[PDB]
Structures are given as structure tokens and as C-alpha cells.
Amino acid sequence: ANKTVVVTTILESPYVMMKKNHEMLEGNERYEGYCVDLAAEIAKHCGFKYKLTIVGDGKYGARDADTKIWNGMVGELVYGKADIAIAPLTITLVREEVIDFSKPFMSLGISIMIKKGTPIESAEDLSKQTEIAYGTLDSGSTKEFFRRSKIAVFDKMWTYMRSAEPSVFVRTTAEGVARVRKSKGKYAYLLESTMNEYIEQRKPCDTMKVGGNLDSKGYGIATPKGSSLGTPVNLAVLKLSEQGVLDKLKNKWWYDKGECGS
Ligand SMILES: CC(C)S(=O)(=O)NC[C@H](C)c1ccc(-c2ccc([C@@H](C)CNS(=O)(=O)C(C)C)cc2)cc1
Ligand SMILES: C=C(C)[C@H]1CN[C@H](C(=O)O)[C@H]1CC(=O)O
């Protein structure tokens, strides 16, 4: 018999956010955003009931080198705590080895956020100077990209970042953004282009994304390996793409009510 599907996700604007009047509400109704709408669409097209839950440890999914335990949403999937993850979860080799990803539902790449006026146009620009500090989230796919890169510029950047004092790493998107905004052009933040483009359209309208992306990848919906949900979820993602629903949802949550003009 069908059993209610436990969705693991995480608060990250505009993917999942607490409604302002969330306290008056209950269950799935508490939340709003791109991934909330997407979960509704997937569930509709797969014929399942579901429960949105916020990941306990606030993490996306990494493996501890010593203990080999997976944390975050990937962890919830691997250890049987959740049946599906619907979040801006980057498709990576290390994650795909232990869970299944759908086809991607959104494209992104690592990108550069600056406070307007910062004299930086590219990663190379960043790598060749020291006056403007720059960094990434303290863990996640961006940091791993830098840690593992053999590309000259990116190698030089990682070498700088891992040793910079005080730390150039941040714990949350909100923190990286606040640091850009409050550092008077002396901090640039390396983050996924999706969040970058989102932030650029929000007041106080004092940041921007500069240069091309450093890589090209996607977010995927994740299921435990061998789940019966894998195939229908994947097909649902293809369908939503082809029906224009993914485009409509990204417009809805990024641009339709952009706050920095046209
Ligand atoms: C991690 C990498 C292997 S990757 O991200 O999967 N691909 C790398 C390559 C550069 C790339 C990167 C991103 C995309 C890409 C293209 C489209 C989309 C959305 C809009 C729809 N995805 S879909 O699979 O094409 C669709 C028909 C459902 C999402 C991601 C396609 C290819
Ligand atoms: C917001 C976080 C911590 C997530 C979102 N996608 C990446 C991931 O799935 O690891 C992380 C961002 C990043 O690494 O820039």
C-alpha cells in the first residue's frame, strides 16, 4: 500500500521559505517557494501524498572523511530517514555514487558576486590580486570544486582561500551576501549562479554577478538508490521541462517580482 512520501528539503531563498504567517499554518502549508511548487508538481504527476520536512542538520550532503557518515539531505536519503530530496541539491559524482539523481531541473554554474563598483570582472581578476578577499561556503559543491581543481586560476584561488586569515569562508548564503554588502567592495563571494541571479533582483539592489560561470551543472531531485520513486520522478521532471513548467516556476520565483527594476 502507498505510504506518505517523506520529502527532505532545506530553507534557502527562493527555493523553500517560511510563509510570513507560518505560525497560523500547518504541515506543507507552512512553506513556499520554487521547490515547494516543484514538490507539488512532482507529487501530482507521480500520484503520491507527501510531507515536507526540513533537514535536521542544515546540510545538503557530504561524507565525513574519517567516519564515512553522510550528513544533510543526502544523509537522510542514504540512512532511510527521507524518501526524496527536493532542494537546490547540486548533482555531483560523489553524491551520485550513493543516491540517484533525476535529470536536472535547473541549470547553474559557480559564479562571482560583487558589491556594485568592485573592480573585478572574472575569476582570473580575483586570482591576481589580494586587496579584494574572496571565498565560498565552508562546505558544499563550490568549495569542493575549488579544492579539487587542476585548472591554474582555480588552483591559485583555492591556494589563497584555504590559507587566508581571517577566514574567507561563510556558513550560509545569507552570510556570504551580508559579507559582500558590508565589506565596501573588499569581499567577493563565490556562489551558484542561481542564487546570484536571485540576489541581484532583491533590495537593496547593491550586488551583481560578474563574468561568465566557472562551470556548468544542474540541480537534481534525489532518491535512495533503488527507490521505486526514481523512475516516475525522473519522467515527471522531463515532462515539467517539456511543458514549460520549470521555466514558469523560475520566472515566478526569480524575476516576476524582481525588486531592482527592469
Ligand atoms: C553534473 C553534470 C553531469 S550535468 O549537470 O548533468 N551536465 C553537464 C552539462 C554542462 C550540462 C549542464 C546543465 C544542463 C542543463 C540543461 C537543462 C536543464 C533544465 C532546464 C532541464 N533539464 S533536462 O535534463 O535537459 C530536461 C530534458 C529534463 C538543467 C541542466 C545540461 C548539461
Ligand atoms: C546552499 C548550499 C550550501 C548548497 C546549494 N548547492 C550546493 C550543494 O548542493 O552542495 C551548495 C552551494 C554551494 O556549494 O555553493
UniProtKB/Swiss-Prot annotation:
Residues where Phosphoserine is found: 149, 183
Tissues and organs where the protein is expressed, per its UniProt entry: Detected in forebrain. Detected in dendrites of neuronal cells. Expressed in the pyramidal cell layers of CA1 and CA3 and in the granule cell layer of the dentate gyrus.
Topology Extracellular: residue spans: 119-262
Annotated positions binding L-glutamate: 88, 90, 95, 141-142, 192
Annotated site residues (Crucial to convey clamshell closure to channel opening) in this chain: 120
Residues flagged as site, Interaction with the cone snail toxin Con-ikot-ikot: 63, 147, 239
Cystine residue pairs: 205-260
Subcellular location: Cell membrane; Postsynaptic cell membrane; Postsynaptic density membrane
Post-translational modification: Palmitoylated. Depalmitoylated upon L-glutamate stimulation. Ubiquitinated by RNF167, leading to its degradation.
Glycosylation sites: 2
Inducers of expression: Down-regulated in the pyramidal cell layer of CA1 in the hippocampus by global ischemia.
Role: Ionotropic glutamate receptor that functions as a ligand-gated cation channel, gated by L-glutamate and glutamatergic agonists such as alpha-amino-3-hydroxy-5-methyl-4-isoxazolepropionic acid (AMPA), quisqualic acid, and kainic acid. L-glutamate acts as an excitatory neurotransmitter at many synapses in the central nervous system and plays an important role in fast excitatory synaptic transmission.
Any further remark recorded for this protein: The postsynaptic actions of L-glutamate are mediated by a variety of receptors that are named according to their selective agonists. This receptor binds AMPA (quisqualate) > L-glutamate > kainate.
Record text on subunit structure and interactions: Homotetramer or heterotetramer of pore-forming glutamate receptor subunits. Tetramers may be formed by the dimerization of dimers. May interact with MPP4. Forms a ternary complex with GRIP1 and CSPG4. Interacts with ATAD1 in an ATP-dependent manner. ATAD1-catalyzed ATP hydrolysis disrupts binding to ATAD1 and to GRIP1 and leads to AMPAR complex disassembly. Interacts with GRIP2. Interacts with GRIP1. Interacts with NSF via its C-terminus. Interacts with CACNG2, PICK1 and GRIP2. Interacts with GRIA1 and SYNDIG1. Part of a complex containing GRIA2, NSF and NAPA and/or NAPB.
Domain topic, free-text comment: The M4 transmembrane segment mediates tetramerization and is required for cell surface expression.
Membership in a protein family: Belongs to the glutamate-gated ion channel (TC 1.A.10.1) family. GRIA2 subfamily.
Name this polypeptide is given: Glutamate receptor 2
Native species: Rattus norvegicus (Rat)
Gene responsible for this protein: Gria2
Portion of the full-length sequence here: 413 to 796 of 883
